Ligand binder design. Sequence first.
Ligand SMILES: N[C@@H](CCC(=O)O)C(=O)O
Ligand SMILES: [Zn+2]
Length: 258
Amino acid sequence: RTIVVTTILESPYVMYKKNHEQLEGNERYEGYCVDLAYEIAKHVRIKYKLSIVGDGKYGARDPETKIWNGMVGELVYGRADIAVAPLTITLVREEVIDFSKPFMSLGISIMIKKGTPIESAEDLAKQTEIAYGTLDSGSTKEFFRRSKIAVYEKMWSYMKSAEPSVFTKTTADGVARVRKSKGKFAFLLESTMNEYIEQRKPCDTMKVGGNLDSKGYGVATPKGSALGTPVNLAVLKLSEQGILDKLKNKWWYDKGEC
Ligand SMILES: N[C@@H](CCC(=O)O)C(=O)O
Ligand SMILES: [Zn+2]
């Protein structure tokens, strides 16, 4: 009866509450997706348990083993019933799991340490003094790997062979690297994460230029799952009732600091 909700520790979607070590189950976490899961469960009328994905990855298929990892994998192999996280709706994922309509709209963006002489993707691509990377094994890395647009093809060419590696295991590592590189490192991440970090102390980063693409995050369920329909309708109702807007403001700006 209790459905398993796989998710990921990514701020401000899912974070450990101040005194998580003193708590258990769902009470250990807080964040946009923790609230979203609560609201969805309320409309779908289900009991659930949040589960942080073991490998801490979003989801990608190994070209060799063909095995899916991350949250996508938890769904594909039946270990999770639903995924409530900033999981990007992509073609390859849509082929193996189901997605609700978007609960958040975003695009790939550029994060720089304030003062960095960069204003666009073209600016990064035409130079090598400033290094740049992305989260490893996510939709952003795939974007550059698959792009047929000149400027992005140039960027992938650089990152693909960059040494040391410019692909971080977590968004947090990417941000830390930007903050510690004195402006010699820029990070490619989704606007949502970018906008959030920009509102947090030391307030030393900022999003520059427009987004590289336009897409969205969706709540995922195993392909053909009976929860897909109810979850989709729940997402649309939350959207139309302004709750998604309320949650975004709550976790991004109301708790602003810059
Ligand atoms: N939202 C992305 C992860 C973040 C990123 O790749 O920038 C995904 O679902 O893979
Ligand atoms: Zn702790």
